[PDB]
Protein backbone atom coordinates (compact mmCIF):
# COMPACT_ATOMS: atom_id res chain seq x y z
CA UNK A 1 0.00 0.00 0.00
CA UNK A 2 2.10 2.83 -1.40
CA UNK A 3 2.68 6.00 0.64
CA UNK A 4 1.77 9.17 -1.27
CA UNK A 5 1.97 12.13 1.19
CA UNK A 6 1.98 13.12 4.83
CA UNK A 7 -0.43 15.49 6.55
CA UNK A 8 -0.23 16.87 10.06
CA UNK A 9 -2.88 17.55 12.70
CA UNK A 10 -1.67 20.57 14.55
CA UNK A 11 -3.22 21.82 17.77
CA UNK A 12 -2.03 24.68 19.97
CA UNK A 13 -3.19 26.58 23.05
CA UNK A 14 -3.77 30.24 22.20
CA UNK A 15 -3.29 31.70 25.71
CA UNK A 16 -6.90 32.80 25.89
CA UNK A 17 -8.61 29.57 27.06
CA UNK A 18 -9.11 27.96 23.71
CA UNK A 19 -7.00 25.70 21.48
CA UNK A 20 -6.95 25.88 17.68
CA UNK A 21 -6.83 22.90 15.37
CA UNK A 22 -5.70 22.64 11.77
CA UNK A 23 -5.14 19.87 9.21
CA UNK A 24 -1.92 20.75 7.45
CA UNK A 25 0.48 20.04 4.60
CA UNK A 26 4.07 20.73 5.54
CA UNK A 27 5.85 23.02 3.16
CA UNK A 28 8.94 21.12 2.15
CA UNK A 29 10.70 18.86 -0.20
CA UNK A 30 11.17 19.12 -3.90
CA UNK A 31 14.61 17.92 -2.69
CA UNK A 32 13.54 15.89 0.41
CA UNK A 33 17.18 15.64 1.61
CA UNK A 34 18.20 14.05 4.97
CA UNK A 35 17.82 16.64 7.74
CA UNK A 36 20.07 17.55 10.65
CA UNK A 37 20.25 20.07 13.48
CA UNK A 38 20.03 23.66 12.20
CA UNK A 39 22.25 24.92 15.13
CA UNK A 40 24.75 22.11 15.70
CA UNK A 41 27.50 20.49 13.68
CA UNK A 42 26.24 16.90 14.26
CA UNK A 43 24.89 15.01 11.27
CA UNK A 44 22.53 13.13 13.54
CA UNK A 45 19.18 12.96 11.85
CA UNK A 46 16.57 15.47 12.95
CA UNK A 47 13.49 14.80 10.81
CA UNK A 48 11.34 17.73 9.65
CA UNK A 49 9.05 19.27 10.58
CA UNK A 50 10.74 19.91 13.85
CA UNK A 51 8.31 19.95 16.75
CA UNK A 52 7.61 22.81 19.13
CA UNK A 53 6.90 22.54 22.82
CA UNK A 54 3.83 24.71 22.30
CA UNK A 55 2.32 22.92 19.29
CA UNK A 56 0.92 19.35 19.31
CA UNK A 57 1.62 17.56 16.00
CA UNK A 58 0.39 14.19 14.91
CA UNK A 59 1.33 12.79 11.49
CA UNK A 60 -1.07 11.15 9.10
CA UNK A 61 -0.24 9.33 6.02
CA UNK A 62 -2.08 9.33 2.68
CA UNK A 63 -1.72 6.18 0.61
CA UNK A 64 -3.34 4.62 -2.38
CA UNK A 65 -5.97 1.97 -2.01
CA UNK B 1 -21.96 27.24 -2.00
CA UNK B 2 -20.07 24.02 -1.29
CA UNK B 3 -17.15 25.19 -3.42
CA UNK B 4 -17.02 28.38 -1.37
CA UNK B 5 -16.91 26.41 1.88
CA UNK B 6 -14.18 24.09 0.61
CA UNK B 7 -12.03 27.08 -0.41
CA UNK B 8 -12.63 28.83 2.91
CA UNK B 9 -10.66 28.75 6.15
CA UNK B 10 -7.32 28.10 4.53
CA UNK B 11 -4.13 29.41 6.21
CA UNK B 12 -0.40 29.59 5.99
CA UNK B 13 0.71 28.62 9.47
CA UNK B 14 4.23 29.22 10.69
CA UNK B 15 5.63 28.24 14.09
CA UNK B 16 8.78 28.82 16.07
CA UNK B 17 10.51 25.51 16.70
CA UNK B 18 12.67 26.89 19.55
CA UNK B 19 15.69 25.77 17.49
CA UNK B 20 16.12 29.05 15.60
CA UNK B 21 14.00 28.05 12.61
CA UNK B 22 10.33 28.31 11.73
CA UNK B 23 8.20 25.51 10.25
CA UNK B 24 5.51 26.42 7.75
CA UNK B 25 2.34 24.63 6.59
CA UNK B 26 -0.63 25.11 4.30
CA UNK B 27 -3.68 24.29 6.35
CA UNK B 28 -7.42 24.03 6.81
CA UNK B 29 -8.67 25.45 10.04
CA UNK B 30 -10.95 22.99 11.80
CA UNK B 31 -13.65 25.46 12.88
CA UNK B 32 -11.79 36.66 15.50
CA UNK B 33 -10.74 33.01 15.06
CA UNK B 34 -8.33 31.32 14.55
CA UNK B 35 -6.14 33.10 17.11
CA UNK B 36 -2.37 33.22 16.95
CA UNK B 37 -0.16 32.38 19.90
CA UNK B 38 3.29 33.70 20.86
CA UNK B 39 5.00 31.10 18.69
CA UNK B 40 2.35 30.51 15.94
CA UNK B 41 1.66 33.00 13.20
CA UNK B 42 -1.15 32.88 10.64
CA UNK B 43 -1.77 34.27 7.20
CA UNK B 44 -5.12 33.86 5.44
CA UNK B 45 -5.15 32.27 1.97
CA UNK B 46 -7.71 33.42 -0.51
CA UNK B 47 -8.68 31.40 -3.55
CA UNK B 48 -9.89 32.99 -6.77
CA UNK B 49 -11.46 30.75 -9.44
CA UNK B 50 -10.46 32.05 -12.78
CA UNK B 51 -13.54 32.02 -15.05
CA UNK B 52 -13.62 29.85 -18.18
CA UNK C 1 -15.02 22.10 10.39
CA UNK C 2 -14.10 18.55 11.59
CA UNK C 3 -11.47 16.05 10.45
CA UNK C 4 -13.58 13.39 8.73
CA UNK C 5 -15.40 15.82 6.39
CA UNK C 6 -12.19 17.46 5.14
CA UNK C 7 -10.30 14.18 4.64
CA UNK C 8 -13.06 12.08 3.09
CA UNK C 9 -13.31 11.34 -0.64
CA UNK C 10 -9.70 11.89 -1.69
CA UNK C 11 -8.70 10.49 -5.07
CA UNK C 12 -6.08 10.07 -7.68
CA UNK C 13 -7.68 10.99 -11.00
CA UNK C 14 -6.35 10.30 -14.52
CA UNK C 15 -7.95 11.08 -17.86
CA UNK C 16 -7.38 10.67 -21.56
CA UNK C 17 -6.91 14.04 -23.21
CA UNK C 18 -7.71 12.45 -26.62
CA UNK C 19 -4.40 13.90 -27.84
CA UNK C 20 -2.01 11.06 -26.97
CA UNK C 21 -1.29 11.88 -23.33
CA UNK C 22 -3.11 11.35 -19.97
CA UNK C 23 -3.43 13.94 -17.23
CA UNK C 24 -3.20 13.02 -13.56
CA UNK C 25 -4.28 14.88 -10.44
CA UNK C 26 -4.56 14.35 -6.73
CA UNK C 27 -8.01 15.51 -5.70
CA UNK C 28 -10.80 16.08 -3.20
CA UNK C 29 -14.27 15.14 -4.53
CA UNK C 30 -17.03 17.72 -4.15
CA UNK C 31 -20.04 15.71 -3.11
CA UNK C 32 -23.27 16.93 -4.75
CA UNK C 33 -25.75 18.35 -2.14
CA UNK C 34 -28.73 16.62 -3.79
CA UNK C 35 -28.81 13.30 -5.59
CA UNK C 36 -29.43 13.93 -9.34
CA UNK C 37 -31.43 10.63 -9.53
CA UNK C 38 -33.31 11.26 -6.23
CA UNK C 39 -36.61 11.50 -8.09
CA UNK C 40 -35.93 9.38 -11.24
CA UNK C 41 -38.74 6.78 -11.71
CA UNK C 42 -36.09 4.00 -12.23
CA UNK C 43 -34.60 4.34 -8.68
CA UNK C 44 -24.42 3.40 -8.15
CA UNK C 45 -21.56 4.74 -6.07
CA UNK C 46 -20.43 8.34 -6.47
CA UNK C 47 -18.10 9.63 -7.75
CA UNK C 48 -18.75 7.85 -11.05
CA UNK C 49 -15.87 7.27 -13.44
CA UNK C 50 -16.31 7.73 -17.23
CA UNK C 51 -15.03 6.09 -20.37
CA UNK C 52 -12.04 8.48 -20.34
CA UNK C 53 -11.56 9.14 -16.57
CA UNK C 54 -10.27 6.67 -13.98
CA UNK C 55 -10.26 7.13 -10.21
CA UNK C 56 -8.36 5.51 -7.41
CA UNK C 57 -9.39 6.38 -3.87
CA UNK C 58 -6.86 7.37 -1.26
CA UNK C 59 -6.70 6.26 2.31
CA UNK C 60 -5.73 8.37 5.32
CA UNK C 61 -4.30 6.68 8.33
CA UNK C 62 -2.26 7.48 11.42
CA UNK C 63 1.52 7.09 11.44
CA UNK C 64 1.87 3.67 13.27
CA UNK D 1 9.45 29.34 -3.14
CA UNK D 2 8.15 26.21 -1.43
CA UNK D 3 4.95 28.20 -1.08
CA UNK D 4 4.75 29.16 -4.74
CA UNK D 5 5.39 25.57 -5.76
CA UNK D 6 2.67 24.25 -3.46
CA UNK D 7 0.14 26.86 -4.64
CA UNK D 8 0.88 26.23 -8.40
CA UNK D 9 -1.23 23.99 -10.64
CA UNK D 10 -4.34 23.89 -8.56
CA UNK D 11 -7.60 23.33 -10.49
CA UNK D 12 -11.32 22.91 -10.26
CA UNK D 13 -11.96 19.87 -12.51
CA UNK D 14 -15.31 18.84 -13.76
CA UNK D 15 -16.15 15.94 -16.03
CA UNK D 16 -19.11 14.42 -17.83
CA UNK D 17 -19.70 10.91 -16.45
CA UNK D 18 -21.84 9.96 -19.49
CA UNK D 19 -24.66 9.12 -17.08
CA UNK D 20 -26.36 12.53 -16.92
CA UNK D 21 -24.29 14.07 -14.19
CA UNK D 22 -20.93 15.76 -13.95
CA UNK D 23 -18.49 15.14 -11.15
CA UNK D 24 -16.42 18.00 -9.67
CA UNK D 25 -13.08 17.87 -7.81
CA UNK D 26 -10.64 20.34 -6.40
CA UNK D 27 -7.24 19.21 -7.54
CA UNK D 28 -3.54 19.49 -7.62
CA UNK D 29 -2.17 18.76 -11.12
CA UNK D 30 0.66 16.29 -11.26
CA UNK D 31 3.18 17.62 -13.79
CA UNK D 32 3.88 15.03 -16.48
CA UNK D 33 7.57 14.12 -16.36
CA UNK D 34 7.44 11.55 -19.20
CA UNK D 35 9.91 12.12 -22.07
CA UNK D 36 7.68 11.03 -24.99
CA UNK D 37 9.31 9.50 -28.10
CA UNK D 38 5.29 19.15 -26.53
CA UNK D 39 1.81 20.70 -25.99
CA UNK D 40 0.68 23.20 -23.24
CA UNK D 41 -0.55 21.55 -20.05
CA UNK D 42 -2.75 20.37 -18.49
CA UNK D 43 -5.02 19.81 -21.49
CA UNK D 44 -8.78 19.69 -21.27
CA UNK D 45 -10.60 16.97 -23.14
CA UNK D 46 -14.09 16.78 -24.75
CA UNK D 47 -15.54 15.68 -21.40
CA UNK D 48 -13.20 17.27 -18.79
CA UNK D 49 -13.12 20.97 -18.16
CA UNK D 50 -10.58 22.82 -15.93
CA UNK D 51 -10.64 26.14 -14.08
CA UNK D 52 -7.51 27.46 -12.40
CA UNK D 53 -7.59 28.03 -8.65
CA UNK D 54 -5.36 31.04 -7.93
CA UNK D 55 -4.21 31.48 -4.35
CA UNK D 56 -3.14 34.79 -2.79
CA UNK D 57 -1.64 35.22 0.66
CA UNK D 58 -2.75 38.03 2.97
CA UNK D 59 -0.26 39.82 5.09
CA UNK D 60 0.30 38.52 8.61
CA UNK D 61 -1.87 40.42 11.07
CA UNK D 62 -0.53 42.68 13.85
CA UNK E 1 19.09 2.87 8.53
CA UNK E 2 17.65 5.74 6.52
CA UNK E 3 17.42 5.52 2.71
CA UNK E 4 19.04 8.49 0.96
CA UNK E 5 19.11 7.73 -2.82
CA UNK E 6 18.89 5.00 -5.43
CA UNK E 7 21.48 4.18 -8.07
CA UNK E 8 21.16 1.79 -10.97
CA UNK E 9 23.60 -0.65 -12.56
CA UNK E 10 22.75 -0.68 -16.20
CA UNK E 11 24.15 -3.18 -18.67
CA UNK E 12 23.25 -3.59 -22.34
CA UNK E 13 24.39 -5.60 -25.35
CA UNK E 14 25.67 -3.29 -28.08
CA UNK E 15 25.10 -5.59 -31.07
CA UNK E 16 28.80 -5.86 -31.76
CA UNK E 17 29.80 -8.65 -29.32
CA UNK E 18 30.36 -6.55 -26.27
CA UNK E 19 28.14 -5.28 -23.44
CA UNK E 20 28.50 -1.88 -21.79
CA UNK E 21 28.12 -1.21 -18.10
CA UNK E 22 27.33 2.00 -16.26
CA UNK E 23 26.57 3.07 -12.68
CA UNK E 24 23.75 5.55 -12.93
CA UNK E 25 21.57 8.13 -11.20
CA UNK E 26 18.06 8.24 -12.62
CA UNK E 27 16.96 11.66 -13.65
CA UNK E 28 13.71 12.20 -11.83
CA UNK E 29 11.84 13.51 -8.92
CA UNK E 30 11.80 16.94 -7.42
CA UNK E 31 8.10 15.92 -7.31
CA UNK E 32 8.49 12.11 -6.91
CA UNK E 33 4.75 11.57 -7.64
CA UNK E 34 3.14 8.08 -7.95
CA UNK E 35 3.67 6.78 -11.51
CA UNK E 36 1.32 5.04 -13.92
CA UNK E 37 1.29 3.77 -17.49
CA UNK E 38 2.25 6.49 -19.99
CA UNK E 39 -0.01 4.89 -22.71
CA UNK E 40 -3.00 3.53 -20.78
CA UNK E 41 -5.76 5.02 -18.69
CA UNK E 42 -5.20 2.65 -15.71
CA UNK E 43 -3.89 4.17 -12.49
CA UNK E 44 -2.13 0.92 -11.69
CA UNK E 45 1.29 1.75 -10.39
CA UNK E 46 4.17 1.49 -12.85
CA UNK E 47 7.29 2.52 -10.93
CA UNK E 48 10.01 4.51 -12.71
CA UNK E 49 12.42 4.01 -14.26
CA UNK E 50 10.54 1.74 -16.55
CA UNK E 51 12.64 -1.18 -17.72
CA UNK E 52 13.57 -2.07 -21.29
CA UNK E 53 13.84 -5.53 -22.74
CA UNK E 54 17.27 -4.61 -24.08
CA UNK E 55 18.75 -3.06 -20.92
CA UNK E 56 19.52 -4.95 -17.68
CA UNK E 57 18.86 -2.77 -14.61
CA UNK E 58 19.61 -3.57 -11.01
CA UNK E 59 18.80 -1.07 -8.26
CA UNK E 60 21.11 -0.14 -5.44
CA UNK E 61 20.30 1.85 -2.46
CA UNK E 62 22.44 4.45 -0.67
CA UNK E 63 21.77 4.88 3.03
CA UNK E 64 23.39 6.50 5.98
CA UNK E 65 25.48 4.51 8.39
CA UNK F 1 45.46 13.35 -12.03
CA UNK F 2 42.98 11.58 -9.75
CA UNK F 3 40.54 14.47 -10.06
CA UNK F 4 40.75 14.16 -13.83
CA UNK F 5 39.97 10.45 -13.68
CA UNK F 6 37.03 10.95 -11.33
CA UNK F 7 35.53 13.58 -13.67
CA UNK F 8 36.09 11.39 -16.72
CA UNK F 9 33.81 8.85 -18.40
CA UNK F 10 30.59 10.55 -17.40
CA UNK F 11 27.52 10.22 -19.67
CA UNK F 12 23.92 11.13 -20.10
CA UNK F 13 22.31 7.84 -21.03
CA UNK F 14 18.83 7.65 -22.50
CA UNK F 15 16.95 4.48 -23.41
CA UNK F 16 13.76 3.55 -25.19
CA UNK F 17 11.43 1.78 -22.78
CA UNK F 18 9.26 0.30 -25.56
CA UNK F 19 6.32 2.10 -23.91
CA UNK F 20 6.65 5.32 -25.91
CA UNK F 21 8.87 7.11 -23.40
CA UNK F 22 12.60 7.37 -22.83
CA UNK F 23 14.36 7.02 -19.46
CA UNK F 24 17.40 9.15 -18.79
CA UNK F 25 20.32 8.80 -16.34
CA UNK F 26 23.55 10.52 -15.36
CA UNK F 27 26.19 7.83 -15.32
CA UNK F 28 29.76 6.67 -14.93
CA UNK F 29 30.90 4.30 -17.58
CA UNK F 30 32.53 1.24 -16.05
CA UNK F 31 35.50 0.97 -18.44
CA UNK F 32 35.32 4.13 -29.65
CA UNK F 33 33.70 3.03 -26.37
CA UNK F 34 31.10 3.11 -24.90
CA UNK F 35 29.00 2.06 -27.90
CA UNK F 36 25.34 2.90 -28.31
CA UNK F 37 22.74 0.32 -29.21
CA UNK F 38 19.49 0.68 -31.17
CA UNK F 39 17.59 1.67 -28.05
CA UNK F 40 20.36 3.35 -25.94
CA UNK F 41 21.74 6.76 -26.73
CA UNK F 42 24.74 8.46 -25.12
CA UNK F 43 25.94 11.99 -24.62
CA UNK F 44 29.32 12.76 -23.08
CA UNK F 45 29.44 15.06 -20.04
CA UNK F 46 32.40 17.31 -19.59
CA UNK F 47 33.31 18.87 -16.28
CA UNK F 48 35.10 22.21 -16.00
CA UNK F 49 36.53 23.24 -12.61
CA UNK F 50 36.11 26.92 -12.24
CA UNK F 51 39.36 28.36 -10.82
CA UNK F 52 39.38 30.08 -7.42
CA UNK G 1 15.15 20.67 -16.53
CA UNK G 2 15.72 17.51 -14.48
CA UNK G 3 19.15 17.58 -16.05
CA UNK G 4 19.89 21.18 -15.12
CA UNK G 5 18.76 20.54 -11.57
CA UNK G 6 20.96 17.46 -11.24
CA UNK G 7 24.00 19.25 -12.69
CA UNK G 8 23.56 22.37 -10.42
CA UNK G 9 25.47 22.93 -7.18
CA UNK G 10 28.29 20.54 -7.77
CA UNK G 11 31.59 21.41 -6.03
CA UNK G 12 35.14 20.39 -5.39
CA UNK G 13 35.47 20.85 -1.59
CA UNK G 14 38.71 20.89 0.24
CA UNK G 15 39.27 21.40 3.94
CA UNK G 16 42.09 21.77 6.43
CA UNK G 17 41.93 18.86 8.89
CA UNK G 18 44.18 20.71 11.39
CA UNK G 19 46.55 17.74 11.26
CA UNK G 20 48.78 18.87 8.39
CA UNK G 21 46.74 17.55 5.53
CA UNK G 22 43.71 18.69 3.59
CA UNK G 23 40.92 16.38 2.54
CA UNK G 24 39.24 16.75 -0.87
CA UNK G 25 35.75 15.64 -1.99
CA UNK G 26 33.64 15.96 -5.06
CA UNK G 27 30.23 17.01 -3.88
CA UNK G 28 26.66 17.84 -4.46
CA UNK G 29 25.55 20.80 -2.30
CA UNK G 30 22.37 20.27 -0.36
CA UNK G 31 20.38 23.52 -0.57
CA UNK G 32 19.53 24.79 2.90
CA UNK G 33 15.74 24.90 3.27
CA UNK G 34 15.72 26.18 6.88
CA UNK G 35 13.70 29.36 7.50
CA UNK G 36 16.00 31.03 10.08
CA UNK G 37 14.45 33.33 12.73
CA UNK G 38 19.88 35.69 3.98
CA UNK G 39 23.50 35.34 2.72
CA UNK G 40 24.75 33.89 -0.66
CA UNK G 41 25.35 30.14 -0.62
CA UNK G 42 27.15 27.86 -0.12
CA UNK G 43 29.58 29.83 2.04
CA UNK G 44 33.22 28.95 2.42
CA UNK G 45 34.73 29.03 5.88
CA UNK G 46 38.28 29.74 7.16
CA UNK G 47 39.18 26.07 6.67
CA UNK G 48 36.88 24.92 3.80
CA UNK G 49 37.37 26.08 0.26
CA UNK G 50 34.98 25.42 -2.68
CA UNK G 51 35.41 25.31 -6.45
CA UNK G 52 32.40 24.99 -8.72
CA UNK G 53 32.19 21.97 -11.01
CA UNK G 54 30.45 23.09 -14.21
CA UNK G 55 29.02 20.37 -16.42
CA UNK G 56 28.39 20.71 -20.16
CA UNK G 57 26.63 18.15 -22.34
CA UNK G 58 27.97 17.23 -25.78
CA UNK G 59 25.61 16.63 -28.61
CA UNK G 60 24.48 13.06 -29.22
CA UNK G 61 26.69 11.42 -31.83
CA UNK G 62 25.47 10.26 -35.26
CA UNK H 1 36.52 1.37 -14.18
CA UNK H 2 34.89 -1.14 -11.75
CA UNK H 3 32.00 -0.85 -9.29
CA UNK H 4 33.79 -0.93 -5.94
CA UNK H 5 36.23 1.92 -6.76
CA UNK H 6 33.49 4.31 -7.91
CA UNK H 7 31.13 3.56 -5.00
CA UNK H 8 33.63 3.48 -2.15
CA UNK H 9 34.13 6.35 0.30
CA UNK H 10 30.79 8.13 -0.04
CA UNK H 11 29.92 10.61 2.70
CA UNK H 12 27.55 13.15 4.04
CA UNK H 13 29.61 16.20 4.99
CA UNK H 14 28.55 19.17 7.14
CA UNK H 15 30.59 22.17 8.22
CA UNK H 16 30.34 25.31 10.28
CA UNK H 17 30.62 28.37 8.09
CA UNK H 18 31.49 30.48 11.19
CA UNK H 19 28.61 32.77 10.17
CA UNK H 20 25.70 31.12 11.99
CA UNK H 21 24.76 28.45 9.46
CA UNK H 22 26.11 24.96 8.50
CA UNK H 23 26.59 23.71 4.96
CA UNK H 24 25.83 20.12 3.99
CA UNK H 25 26.88 18.06 0.98
CA UNK H 26 26.69 14.53 -0.30
CA UNK H 27 30.16 13.58 -1.45
CA UNK H 28 32.74 11.19 -2.86
CA UNK H 29 36.11 11.32 -1.06
CA UNK H 30 39.22 11.70 -3.21
CA UNK H 31 41.72 9.36 -1.64
CA UNK H 32 45.26 10.80 -1.59
CA UNK H 33 47.67 8.75 -3.82
CA UNK H 34 50.46 8.89 -1.22
CA UNK H 35 50.16 8.92 2.54
CA UNK H 36 51.26 12.37 3.85
CA UNK H 37 52.68 10.69 7.03
CA UNK H 38 54.28 7.78 5.08
CA UNK H 39 57.76 8.95 6.11
CA UNK H 40 57.05 10.85 9.39
CA UNK H 41 59.40 9.58 12.17
CA UNK H 42 56.39 9.21 14.57
CA UNK H 43 54.62 6.52 12.43
CA UNK H 44 44.43 7.37 11.96
CA UNK H 45 41.64 6.66 9.50
CA UNK H 46 41.19 8.85 6.43
CA UNK H 47 39.26 10.95 5.68
CA UNK H 48 39.93 12.91 8.88
CA UNK H 49 37.25 15.22 10.23
CA UNK H 50 38.15 18.66 11.69
CA UNK H 51 36.93 20.87 14.49
CA UNK H 52 34.41 22.44 12.09
CA UNK H 53 33.67 19.54 9.66
CA UNK H 54 31.72 16.37 10.44
CA UNK H 55 31.40 13.29 8.24
CA UNK H 56 28.98 10.43 8.13
CA UNK H 57 29.78 7.57 5.78
CA UNK H 58 27.19 6.18 3.41
CA UNK H 59 26.49 2.58 2.65
CA UNK H 60 25.59 1.09 -0.73
CA UNK H 61 23.59 -2.07 -0.84
CA UNK H 62 21.41 -4.05 -3.22
CA UNK H 63 17.64 -3.60 -3.28
CA UNK H 64 16.53 -6.70 -1.20
TrEMBL record, chains A, E:
<protein>
    <submittedName>
        <fullName>SdbC</fullName>
    </submittedName>
</protein>
<feature type="domain" description="SdbC C-terminal">
    <location>
        <begin position="1"/>
        <end position="65"/>
    </location>
</feature>
UniProtKB/TrEMBL annotation, chains B, F:
<protein>
    <submittedName>
        <fullName>SdbC</fullName>
    </submittedName>
</protein>
<feature type="domain" description="SdbC C-terminal">
    <location>
        <begin position="1"/>
        <end position="52"/>
    </location>
</feature>
Amino acid sequence: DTHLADLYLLKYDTGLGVYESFICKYLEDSNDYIASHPQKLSLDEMPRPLESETVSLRQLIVSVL
